[model samples]
Target chain A: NQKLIANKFNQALGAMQTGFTTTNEAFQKVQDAVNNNAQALSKLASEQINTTLLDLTYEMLSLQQVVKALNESYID
Target chain B: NQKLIANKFNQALGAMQTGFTTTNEAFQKVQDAVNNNAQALSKLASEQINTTLLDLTYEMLSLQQVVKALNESYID
Candidate 1:
């Protein structure tokens, strides 16, 4: 029973890790989409708009760093 | 035929909801990780570093709001 429970837990952990990997891939696509759109829009928008988007991009990078660290610590 | 199409649409929506939920979880984890690390690093880093991380956190919150709005408008 103890061995069975351990196997079950390991299976669940594997599932969770797979889910997280899929989620990370989806977000990477989202991030790419946002960046591509921002790049295109910046060319047509005002200076302030471009600056704001650029700043947002920088923030996004920092967020990515945090995510990377989390993955490194736990998932990877 | 119409009912079949509706079923497919509903299935797609379900998948999208699942994907979004997973993405939200990942981002929340990232946010928590950043907050925890920032708390620890601030003590060791300069004031500017702390301020930058704080600003990044704020921007991340705004990004989360935008994502929430997107999900609300499109997914929900």
Candidate 2:
């Protein structure tokens, strides 16, 4: 049963990892575009872009916490 | 240049959508497992599981915001 649970968690972990990677890639792309067009963006638009990036960063950190919890559980 | 920027933003949006889907799937799997094994988990473990789920939920919301912003920008 423990092994089974571990397997399930691993599957979840894998999916989360994939999601994180993709999210990171998306963020990078947006960042690049935003940087390139900094002069063109209106103040409000720039603020929204920054806000979204911050949200993405927060999400990444939360995912990291989830991974940490899973790792600890698996080891124990 | 505006078209180029929009194209880049679209690519980023696509990647973010993929990430959000994968994350949601992962969260669902873990939620299923947690529900199935609720009796087996220690108090601390259960709390961690809940916390992780909450984090995933928050991330989803954040992703939605990003998408909304992107769409608004694209439209305008």
Candidate 3:
């Protein structure tokens, strides 16, 4: 059970990090694309990307809390 | 309101990041100074600096946890 919990914790952390990195990259790409072409389509794309990034950031924060709590409960 | 909570989350995160940066810089400076001078007075100063740095590091970690918690509550 402890091992299962530990494995799940690690998986969650890795997923969280990947999500954050992906979201950051996506956000930067959106900004660059918008800067290069300020068309209506580009604006829509940027808005959608920004929303996705915000969602990913919130997920990252959620995972951070879970990791902290798990560490405090099990390891600390 | 959600807006107020979001604002507080941002403020807390900013403070946490600033605290971590300050503590990290302080620790690096002490390390550099100690390596440059290893005399008795320098060693004494280094010890004092190390203690203070440890305290600052703890504060930074605590603030980090707080910011993480606040973000989870506000944004998620």
Candidate 4:
């Protein structure tokens, strides 16, 4: 159940095509995804918290890539 | 801070090369990644969760394809 749920969140994260401008943007999107799926996100039976956290971590990395690329190109 | 932190966590997830048999396995690995880099993953900045997740999903899909191919072969 937890893995399935995490994978669902992973699917959502994977769907984000554009880069996030701010950590807030990334976090906001994650919050939106989680809130939108509040019903499914809640009621963690076991180890669900771990997946949720990692999902966010994945988002962060994507955000960094976007920002780094943006800054590098901004000066060029 | 957050995005950078999240990206640090992201690199860890991206490093996972093995297939997760249980959600627990995935969850636990995620936790370990987070715990291993607690300070870095703490603060938030911007969003950059990309590529790795897409690649991961793509990899998983390919794995599914392998299973499908194997199954088809088994029936032959």
* lDDT winner: 2
Candidate 4, which segments miss by more than 4 Å at Cα? A1-19, A22-27, A32-54, B1-76
Q: Scored by CA lDDT, what does every candidate get?
A: 0.43, 0.44, 0.39, 0.36
Candidate 4 per-residue lDDT, tens place, B1-76, comes to 4344344334323322111122223334344443433322232212142211112445445645543443443211
In terms of TM-score, the best-performing candidate is: 1
* Winner by DockQ: 4
> Candidate 3: which stretches are off by over 4 Å?
A1-76, B39-76
With candidate 2 superimposed using the best TM-score fit, by how many Å does residue A40's alpha carbon deviate from the native? 57
lDDT of 3 at B69: 43
Per-residue lDDT of B1-76 in model 3, one digit per residue for the tens? 7456455645644554454445445544543443343243335443422211112234334434433443342232
Worst 10 residues of 2 chain B by lDDT: B35-44
For model 2, how does the per-residue alpha-carbon lDDT over A34-71 read when each residue is reduced to its tens digit?
Answer: 33433333342434222111123454455444444433
The deviation in Å at residue B43 for candidate 3 is: 14
For A20-60, candidate 4 gives per-residue lDDT tens digits of 34432545464455444433333432212322333445445
Per-residue alpha-carbon lDDT of candidate 2 for residues B21-66, written as tens digits (9 for 90 to 100): 4455544443443333332233324334442222346766675676
Where is model 1 more than 4 Å wrong at Cα? Answer: A1-23, A26-76, B46-51, B54-76
DockQ of 3: 0.01
Ranking, TM-score, top scorer first? 1, 2, 3, 4
Error of 2 at A24 (Å): 9.8
Query: Candidate 1, residues B3-74: lDDT per residue as tens digits?
Result: 443343344333334444444454554445444444444443432653333234555565456556545533
